[PDB]
Design a protein around this ligand. Structure first.
Ligand SMILES: OC[C@H]1O[C@@H](O[C@H]2[C@H](O)[C@@H](O)[C@H](O[C@H]3[C@H](O)[C@@H](O)[C@H](O)O[C@@H]3CO)O[C@@H]2CO)[C@H](O)[C@@H](O)[C@@H]1O
Ligand SMILES: OC[C@H]1O[C@@H](O[C@H]2[C@H](O)[C@@H](O)[C@H](O)O[C@@H]2CO)[C@H](O)[C@@H](O)[C@@H]1O
Ligand SMILES: [Ca+2]
Ligand SMILES: [Ca+2]
Ligand SMILES: [Mg+2]
Ligand SMILES: [Mg+2]
Ligand SMILES: [Mg+2]
Ligand SMILES: [Mg+2]
Length: 611
């Protein structure tokens, strides 16, 4: 498999998750500014960071877990990133998350750990750029603690400091300053009691693991052994295997449990047997098995841990196995076992079963990941359109069940959602496979997509008619996607040939235009205006400027306008047949897309034709 391309796309995945004011240097044409008022409720700029999964909540625990894991990869395999030419991209990602965590620590002792409400956010299915719901900010402090999330963020900031120190020593120091404050908060409190806004999504079941993980990274960033001593001091407090006094080993590294990564690092830093034994017990359980126990394996080779995000778990363990196998302290006989495991799990994700589980990569990749912005519905419907308008490159889907079963459907969020933490360890494992087996990334890769549907259209039909008038029912639709956006400067024009009016000795400008119905309070229908009088062409201008038309609902994306143009009552010379906009017009109140009632966006024609 082409591991370099996979690595390249896995890193790119995060760029599509970005919230906030996006860079001018962005390499896609379908994501734009969003969550621009994040933090406005507390008077703090909390814009930026990454949306968690297929949704738009910013959950700092998995977000910081993710950036800490990406930095860990860059720390372990900078040469792989340099050789593949992806170094700039992963560093930009790491900085994107950490710049946001810094904003979340506005003053010593205060940490905002979330922006958005799961309940409200998930109740709407649409693109990030046009979210209309409230996005509350939540914080922890001395009176309401969040040890896991504060320490997880400290680990992200400290690991970022380690990998940025050589090229940007000042940013490294900035990261360390904030990591120290957040760790102090976490260490002083030793409680997750104030971390409640993520209930039902990312509630924490442990924080001593996060304390050790953060302390290890702060040790590597500052070289102050005060932190190494702390890291080791929490070990007795880590969860144990049931009815044993053995450090847990039957799960895997993940957003809720980072003792696996902490013990791996502590083994390399101290060479103490306790840590070596602990990480090898975990890696053994995942490979050969240990003490009669072994993680389940699917018939096709996937180490299967749990129903949700099976690939996320397997590929993360693959990364840890790769890191540990390269360490001189690893039991020699297990080096090959662990490396074989890294390859088998990554290959399963990339295509060993005959298809890829990575969006926009390989053979028969997933087409319907549970992701709002990549899908791009403009009607608040998971079912419409019936295909994803965008390709969210690099995203690793949840994964199959214990029997390799997998259904690529948008509503399957258990096995087909995509998320920050899903790609975290995966990215690191990919860097290792690239280093070993290669595969050239795509040069100058970008995600500038072809526009696949007219972004703003109009449908019309004959509402009412008479010997002296024509009444039109028109509906404008915002189907924007590159990027999805509010269209508050839309207008359209209805063209007529009024030669018969001039011939009747009547002023075309005196005809009466009117509207008996229209959605939108700003809808304005003009009187008859001249367009090309040499050919007796006049028009009615319908301005929708000011209307908050956006691709996020059946009513939200459309504006209906009914308007009539009429010659004097009792007259019979009105002739709609020579009117440009009347040609082909649906003969009734049931509208259809028309191309002769042009739509304009800030005066620029974007749909339809003029006379
Ligand atoms: O031995 C059990 C292990 O449990 C781990 O916690 C897991 C929770 O039990 C599980 O409910 C939760 O599932 C999440 C999933 O992680 C998340 O990514 C997905 O989006 O939603 C699911 C809930 O609907 O996962 C956590 C973490 O794996 C402990 O962390 C671990 O120590 C313990 O051994
Ligand atoms: O929490 C699981 C999953 O929920 C997704 O939102 C669901 C919501 O949970 C359900 O009550 C509603 O009926 O449908 C929506 C859309 O499927 C959410 O999109 C995922 O991010 C989340 O993992
Ligand atoms: Ca934890
Ligand atoms: Ca006419
Ligand atoms: Mg900008
Ligand atoms: Mg979820
Ligand atoms: Mg399909
Ligand atoms: Mg004519």
């Amino acid at each position: 498999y082409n591991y370099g391309e996979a690595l390249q796309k896995s890193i790119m995945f995060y760029e599509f998750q970005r919230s906030g004011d996006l860079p001018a240097d962005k390499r896609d044409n379908w994501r734009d500014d969003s969550g621009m008022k994040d933090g406005s409720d507390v008077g703090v700029d909390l814009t930026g960071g990454w949306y968690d999964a297929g949704d738009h909540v910013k959950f700092n625990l998995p977000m910081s877990y993710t950036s800490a894991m990406l930095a860990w990869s860059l720390y372990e395999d900078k040469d792989a990133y340099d050789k593949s030419g992806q170094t700039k991209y992963i560093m930009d990602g790491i900085k994107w998350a950490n710049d946001y965590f810094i904003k979340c620590n506005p003053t010593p002792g205060v940490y905002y750990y979330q922006v958005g409400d799961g309940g409200k956010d998930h109740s709407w299915w649409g693109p990030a750029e046009v979210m209309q719901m409230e996005r509350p900010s939540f914080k922890v402090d001395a009176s309401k603690p969040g040890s896991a999330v504060c320490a997880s963020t400290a680990a992200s900031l400290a690991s970022a400091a380690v990998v940025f120190k050589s090229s940007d020593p000042t940013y490294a120091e900035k990261c360390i300053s904030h990591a120290k404050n957040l760790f102090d908060m976490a260490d002083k409190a030793k409680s997750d009691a104030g971390y409640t806004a993520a209930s039902g999504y990312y509630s924490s079941s442990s924080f001593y693991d996060d304390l050790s993980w953060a302390a290890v990274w702060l040790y590597l960033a500052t070289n102050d052994s005060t932190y190494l001593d702390k890291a080791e001091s929490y070990v007795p407090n880590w969860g144990k295997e049931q009815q044993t006094d053995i450090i847990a080993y039957k799960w895997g590294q993940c957003w809720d449990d980072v003792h696996y990564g902490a013990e791996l690092l502590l083994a390399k830093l101290t060479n103490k047997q306790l840590y070596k034994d602990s990480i090898e017990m975990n890696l053994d359980f995942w490979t050969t098995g240990v003490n009669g126990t072994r993680v389940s394996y699917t018939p096709k080779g996937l180490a299967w841990l749990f129903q949700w995000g099976s690939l996320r778990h397997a590929t993360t363990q693959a990364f840890l196995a790769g890191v540990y196998a390269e360490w001189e302290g690893c039991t020699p006989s297990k080096v090959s076992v662990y490396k074989d495991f890294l390859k088998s799990q990554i290959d399963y994700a990339l295509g060993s079963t005959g298809r890829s589980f990575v969006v926009g990569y390989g053979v028969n990749p997933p087409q319907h990941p549970h992701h709002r912005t990549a899908h791009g519905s403009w009607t608040d419907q998971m079912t419409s359109p019936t295909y994803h308008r965008h390709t969210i490159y690099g995203a690793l889907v949840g994964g199959p069940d214990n029997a390799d079963g997998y259904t690529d459907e948008i509503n399957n969020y258990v096995n087909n959602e995509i998320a920050c933490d899903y790609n975290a360890g995966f990215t690191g494992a990919l860097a290792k496979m690239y280093k070993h087996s290669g595969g050239d990334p795509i040069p100058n890769f970008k995600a500038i997509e072809k526009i696949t549907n007219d972004e703003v259209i109009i449908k019309a039909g004959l509402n009412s008619t008479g010997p002296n008038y024509t009444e039109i029912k028109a509906v404008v639709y915002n189907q924007t996607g590159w990027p999805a956006r509010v269209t508050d400067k839309i207008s359209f024009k209805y063209f007529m040939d009024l030669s018969e009016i001039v011939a009747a000795g009547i002023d075309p400008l005196s005809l009466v235009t009117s509207s008996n119905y229209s959605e939108g309070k700003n809808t304005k229908v003009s009187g008859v205006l001249p367009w090309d009088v040499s050919n007796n062409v006049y028009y009615v201008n319908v301005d929708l400027t000011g209307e908050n038309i956006y691709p996020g609902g059946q009513s939200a994306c459309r504006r209906e306008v009914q308007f009539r143009i009429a010659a004097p009552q009792g007259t019979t010379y009105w002739n709609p047949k020579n009117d440009f906009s009347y040609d082909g017009l649906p003969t009734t109140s049931t509208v259809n897309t028309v191309t002769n009632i042009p739509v304009y966006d800030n005066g620029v024609k974007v749909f339809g034709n003029e006379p």
